[PDB]
Amino acid sequence: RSIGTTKLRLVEFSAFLEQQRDPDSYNKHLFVHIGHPLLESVDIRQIYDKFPEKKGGLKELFGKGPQNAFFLVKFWADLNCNGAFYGVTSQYESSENMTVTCSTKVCSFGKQVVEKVETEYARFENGRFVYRINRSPMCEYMINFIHKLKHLPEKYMMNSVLENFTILLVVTNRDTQETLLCMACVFEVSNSEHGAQHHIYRLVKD
């Protein structure tokens, strides 16, 4: 049960808030995290309306394939939190040496409102190629979004707002423009005591 193919695997993903109250005090809160037996599948037609369908959109990407590179992740975000830094850290691995392009699209009502684009180079670690995106800063839209969500009286309202909010992550082989991984993300707010949770699904044609 992992987000990955024979060519690229997402090893770790986490989104967080870091707070440094004084020089001796450090605090880090995770909003969501991945990575720290068979996957269920999801008909991709059930989510096309959740993501951009122009040129370079999910439907087009999925048609080009490989379809085994495509995943839907349902997150329960941990918003239970009180110098502040909002960031995202991720790690990928491959058997092949590549220059990798990582595209993160924030989408509201199925339309792209923000795209972050990062280029990553392989380091050889522990017998394979590894890609690390360390402490990537959250765009202002995300930070303001988390704040407004938190100002809401009840959790069910937050969930209602999240109905229209998705994130699409696409990782591309820079040399071949091949899709390595695509992660379509949907969110609810956690109500558990273990905090953030998630489900991973394979996206399939019908």
Binding site: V42, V114, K116, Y141, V186
Partner: protein
């Protein structure tokens, strides 16, 4: 990092909330709720 922020991102973000806080006033698209869609039962039941 390269970041492309769309023209009305502040408006758009506000639209995200009054869509739920002021539904009859907000002029925003509507959608089938995820938990009502043809998806695995686990989708709205946390592990």
């Amino acid at each position: 990092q390269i970041v492309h922020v769309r023209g009305d991102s502040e408006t758009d973000l506000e639209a995200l909330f009054n869509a739920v806080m002021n539904p009859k006033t907000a002029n925003v698209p509507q959608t089938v709720p995820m938990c009502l869609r043809k998806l695995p039962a686990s989708f709205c039941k946390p592990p």
